[PDB]
Each structure stands twice: as structure tokens, then as C-alpha cells.
Amino acid sequence: ATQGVFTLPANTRFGVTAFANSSGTQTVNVLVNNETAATFSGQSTNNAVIGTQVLNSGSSGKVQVQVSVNGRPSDLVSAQVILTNELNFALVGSEDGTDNDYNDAVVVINWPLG
Amino acid sequence: ATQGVFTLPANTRFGVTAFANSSGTQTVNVLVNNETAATFSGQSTNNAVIGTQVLNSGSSGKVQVQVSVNGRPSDLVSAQVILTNELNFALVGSEDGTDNDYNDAVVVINWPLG
Amino acid sequence: ATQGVFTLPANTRFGVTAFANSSGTQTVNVLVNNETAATFSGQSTNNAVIGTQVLNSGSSGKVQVQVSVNGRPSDLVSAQVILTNELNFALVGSEDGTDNDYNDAVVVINWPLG
Amino acid sequence: ATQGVFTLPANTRFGVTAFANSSGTQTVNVLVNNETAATFSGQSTNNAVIGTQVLNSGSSGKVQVQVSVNGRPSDLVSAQVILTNELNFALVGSEDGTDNDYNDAVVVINWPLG
Ligand SMILES: OC[C@@]1(O)OC[C@@H](O)[C@@H](O)[C@@H]1O
Ligand SMILES: OC[C@@]1(O)OC[C@@H](O)[C@@H](O)[C@@H]1O
Ligand SMILES: OC[C@@]1(O)OC[C@@H](O)[C@@H](O)[C@@H]1O
Ligand SMILES: OC[C@@]1(O)OC[C@@H](O)[C@@H](O)[C@@H]1O
Ligand SMILES: [Ca+2]
Ligand SMILES: [Ca+2]
Ligand SMILES: [Ca+2]
Ligand SMILES: [Ca+2]
Ligand SMILES: [Ca+2]
Ligand SMILES: [Ca+2]
Numbered sequence: 102a103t104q105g106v107f108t109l110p111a112n113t114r115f116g117v118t119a120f121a122n123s124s125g126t127q128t129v130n131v132l133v134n135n136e137t138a139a140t141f142s143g144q145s146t147n148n149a150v151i152g153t154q155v156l157n158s159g160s161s162g163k164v165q166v167q168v169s170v171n172g173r174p175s176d177l178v179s180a181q182v183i184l185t186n187e188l189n190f191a192l193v194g195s196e197d198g199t200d201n202d203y204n205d206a207v208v209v210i211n212w213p214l215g
Numbered sequence: 216a217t218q219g220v221f222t223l224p225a226n227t228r229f230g231v232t233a234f235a236n237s238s239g240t241q242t243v244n245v246l247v248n249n250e251t252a253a254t255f256s257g258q259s260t261n262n263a264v265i266g267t268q269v270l271n272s273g274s275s276g277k278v279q280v281q282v283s284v285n286g287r288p289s290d291l292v293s294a295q296v297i298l299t300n301e302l303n304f305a306l307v308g309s310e311d312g313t314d315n316d317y318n319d320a321v322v323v324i325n326w327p328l329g
Numbered sequence: 330a331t332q333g334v335f336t337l338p339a340n341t342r343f344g345v346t347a348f349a350n351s352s353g354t355q356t357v358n359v360l361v362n363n364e365t366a367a368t369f370s371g372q373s374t375n376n377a378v379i380g381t382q383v384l385n386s387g388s389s390g391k392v393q394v395q396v397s398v399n400g401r402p403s404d405l406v407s408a409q410v411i412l413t414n415e416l417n418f419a420l421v422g423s424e425d426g427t428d429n430d431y432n433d434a435v436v437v438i439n440w441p442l443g
Numbered sequence: 444a445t446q447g448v449f450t451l452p453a454n455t456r457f458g459v460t461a462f463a464n465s466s467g468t469q470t471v472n473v474l475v476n477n478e479t480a481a482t483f484s485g486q487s488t489n490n491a492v493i494g495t496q497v498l499n500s501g502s503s504g505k506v507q508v509q510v511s512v513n514g515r516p517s518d519l520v521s522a523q524v525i526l527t528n529e530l531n532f533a534l535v536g537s538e539d540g541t542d543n544d545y546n547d548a549v550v551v552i553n554w555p556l557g
């Protein structure tokens with residue numbers, strides 16, 4: 102099944118933050134309405150934040166997270182969780198190798214903000 | 216029901232990161248085996264990261280997140296989500312006022328690391 | 330924080346199913362747009378299904394699950410999880426006593442159907 | 444990533460329930476420690492319960508849900524959610540065709556029981 106794709110309410114500010122846990126340099130791309138809106142790149146094996154930014158879901162509300170290492174797309178796992186019917190978390194994990202820890206690049210999208 | 220308390224596998228490294236979305240200064244305290252292990256403090260209405268750190272769950276695996284503003288405990292909401300039976304997210308939202316956006320202090324705990 | 334309240338897409342068919350795990354008779358009430366739409370009642374300590382039904386979210390999309398034992402409201406815990414940005418689960422747990430297993434009445438709402 | 448596999452605490456009673464939403468007959472197989480423990484079969488396009496049963500996670504705690512239609516494995520989506528660090532839900536969705544509603548066979552595993 103497709104992973105890393107989330108439908109957010111339209112024209113809503115949301116945060117996107119990425120963490121790295123791999124020897125390989127992680128390239129995290131965030132698309133809004135199928136067009137790039139943010140790109141983070143970094144390397145860490147200690148969960149360092151390689152990027153964080155505030156974006157707007159726009160008219161479509163479509164947000165997609167892509168993760169690659171040296172140009173090769175990583176396998177993604179994702180889900181959205183909503184607490185008290187208000188607080189949203191769109192979560193993404195990714196695997197660039199063979200150990201299957203799926204934390205090589207971890208991306209957290211949260212809203213509402215402010 | 217109690218919120219903000221999570222049982223992680225023993226002696227496991229995990230990451231904890233906090234974001235702020237409120238006029239009030241957020242004080243996030245993380246306890247491991249009922250003893251403080253990390254404290255983040257900051258203010259932002261734009262989802263700024265007020266802290267991030269790598270901790271160890273220790274022998275008990277008990278991790279508890281506390282959030283307060285000017286010494287008054289905020290109301291918490293939380294849940295744990297596991298993807299592909301490997302990637303874990305312990306999520307916490309908090310409300311310090313009356314608008315109920317529960318994002319005043321948002322805390323994300325993730326594991327495994329590395 | 331409020332629990333047991335979910336905003337579903339408008340005019341959408343959804344399923345609601347309740348399980349019981351308590352000595353007390355569980356009364357599960359489901360409200361759509363603040364008006365009762367379904368009521369299940371039963372007793373079991375072996376997770377028996379005390380009710381299942383197909384409802385429509387209607388114009389408001391507001392769905393609220395209430396659980397009580399002998400007229401006393403139980404304490405609720407809840408969350409919504411979305412898989413592959415399509416499959417939705419609105420989950421509710423409830424505690425009628427002191428052991429805090431929160432399974433006395435477990436309610437699962439799922440959509441889409443068909 | 445692998446889906447439909449969950450690690451439950453050892454020797455713990457859990458419930459497993461399946462719903463159907465497809466023209467095709469759904470065959471849901473539940474394995475405990477890689478050995479079949481339950482099999483449900485049924486057809487419905489109205490979310491009918493095609494099976495529910497109480498099982499024990501056993502010594503390994505390994506539980507895997509498989510779904511097939513006419514012998515062809517369906518594509519699975521899954522996740523585990525824990526509320527108030529006590530109530531567990533292992534969720535599975537499946538797609539047997541091309542519309543991607545992933546509800547053709549929906550499986551819910553919950554614990555603790557009693
Ligand atoms: O070379 C990449 C890789 O093996 O790096 C070490 C660990 O972070 C792994 O999970 C990751 O797949
Ligand atoms: O004064 C605190 C408060 O009102 O600040 C503005 C918003 O972030 C609110 O959600 C928050 O409760
Ligand atoms: O008398 C009610 C109660 O104690 O019944 C036995 C168990 O199911 C408990 O969790 C429940 O709170
Ligand atoms: O023939 C199988 C199928 O098309 O049946 C009707 C709907 O339930 C669909 O989602 C399902 O994939
Ligand atoms: Ca890896
Ligand atoms: Ca890794
Ligand atoms: Ca607030
Ligand atoms: Ca706020
Ligand atoms: Ca109880
Ligand atoms: Ca009980």
C-alpha cells in the first residue's frame with residue numbers, strides 16, 4: 102500500500118521535522134499538491150534533527166513525504182493519529198538498508214500550530 | 216485516564232523532542248523510572264523545537280512526560296503507535312488554556328535509534 | 330481532554346462494534362450530530378460482541394461514543410488512526426472500576442465500508 | 444514493509460475479530476508462533492462480522508494476520524495503537540482489488556481481556 106501520503110485540512114499551517122538514524126545521508130522531500138515545498142538533508146546515527154519547517158497544506162491539502170539515500174528511494178511506513186479529535190500527527194519511518202529498523206529517516210508532521 | 220506515561224523496552228535508547236505553540240513558556244519534564252532525565256523550556260507560537268535529546272529507558276522502561284506553564288500542570292493527551300512492528304512513536308499533546316488545540320507543548324518520543 | 334468524540338467525513342457509512350470485558354452490564358450509546366443513533370447493551374468477561382451496526386455520519390459528521398454501567402458514565406480513552414490515508418479506525422476504551430484495564434467496554438468504529 | 448505482524452506480551456489472552464467489505468469471499472488466517480490458531484471465512488459488503496475469537500499469544504507472543512481471496516493473498520496495511528499505556532489495538536486492513544479502499548477484510552485484535 103502507498104505510504105507517506107496524507108490529506109490535511111486545506112489551507113492549514115503544519116510542521117514537518119526529520120530525524121536521522123543511519124550511516125547514509127538522508128534526503129527528505131516534502132511535496133504539497135505534488136510540488137516540492139521543503140527538502141532536508143543530513144546524516145546522523147544519533148537521531149539528530151536534520152530539518153524542521155512550517156508549511157501550509159494549501160488548497161489541496163495533499164502532503165507527501167519522500168525519503169532517499171544517494172538518489173535511491175527508501176521503503177516507507179506511515180500512519181496518521183488524531184488525539185482528542187484535534188491534535189494530528191502524520192508519521193513516517195523509512196528503511197534504506199537491510200536491518201529493517203525503519204528509523205533511517207523519521208519524519209513527523211504535526212498540526213494545528215500556534 | 217492517565218496520559219503521558221509509556222512503557223518502553225528496558226535499556227533502550229530513545230529520542231525525545233518538544234515543540235511549542237503557545238504564548239506561555241512551556242516547561243517539559245521527562246522522567247525515567249520516576250526520576251527526571253531531561254527538562255526543556257522554551258516559548259514559541261510557530262512550532263519551534265524547544266528541545267531534543269537522546270535518553271535511555273533504563274531498567275524499568277518507564278518514561279513519563281510532564282508539561283507545565285508557570286508551574287501549573289497542563290492537561291495531557293497521549294498515545295503510542297507502532298509501525299511495521301518495529302518503529303515506535305510515543306506522542307504527547309498538552310493544553311495550557313481554554314482553546315483546546317492541545318498543541319501548546321507537543322512532545323514526540325521515538326525509538327529505536329541508530 | 331474530551332474522549333470518545335470523532336469527526337467523520339459527512340454523509341459516510343461507518344461501522345460501530347462493541348466488546349465487553351467486565352462483570353458489569355455495559356451500555357454503549359452512539360450519538361450522531363448529538364442525537365442517539367445506536368445503543369448496545371450486554372455483559373461479558375470474554376470479549377463478546379455486545380453489538381455491531383452500520384450507521385451514517387450524516388451532515389455534521391459528528392460521532393460520539395458514550396459508555397455507562399448501571400447509569401454511571403465510565404471513564405473513556407480514545408484515538409483515531411488512519412492507514413494508507415484511506416482506512417479509518419476510531420477507537421474507544423472505557424473503565425468502569427478501579428483496575429484500569431480500560432477494556433470494560435471496547436468500541437471500534439471503522440470506515441469506509443462496502 | 445511487512446504488515447500484519449504483531450508482538451504481543453507473552454501468554455496473554457487477546458481477541459481477534461474480522462469484518463468483510465467486498466464482493467469476494469474473505470479468508471482470514473491468524474497465526475500464533477507461526478502456526479495457525481484461527482481461520483475466519485465469509486462474505487459481506489456491509490461490514491458483517493465474519494468471525495471473532497479469543498486466542499492466547501503463547502510463549503512467543505508472535506501474532507500474524509493473513510488475508511486472501513480465492514487463494515490470492517491481499518495487500519495488507521497495519522499498525523498497533525496503545526491507549527493510556529494499557530489498552531492495545533492491533534489493526535489490519537486489506538485490499539483484494541483495485542479500488543484501494545483497504546477494507547475488504549478488516550481485522551481488529553485487542554487486549555487485555557477480562
Ligand atoms: O548503511 C545504512 C544503515 O545500515 O546504517 C546503520 C543503521 O542505522 C542502519 O539501520 C542503516 O540501514
Ligand atoms: O496564553 C496561552 C494560549 O492561549 O496561547 C495562544 C495559543 O497557542 C493557545 O492555544 C494557548 O492556550
Ligand atoms: O466489577 C467491574 C470489573 O472489576 O469487573 C472485572 C474486570 O473486567 C474489571 O476490569 C472491571 O472494572
Ligand atoms: O471484487 C472485489 C471488490 O471490488 O468488491 C467491491 C468493493 O468492496 C471493493 O473494494 C473490492 O476490492
Ligand atoms: Ca535501517
Ligand atoms: Ca537505522
Ligand atoms: Ca491551547
Ligand atoms: Ca496553542
Ligand atoms: Ca476495568
Ligand atoms: Ca475489564
Ligand SMILES: [Ca+2]
Nearest residue numbers: 540543544545
Ligand atoms: Ca477493495
Ligand SMILES: [Ca+2]
Nearest residue numbers: 443464546547
Ligand atoms: Ca471494499
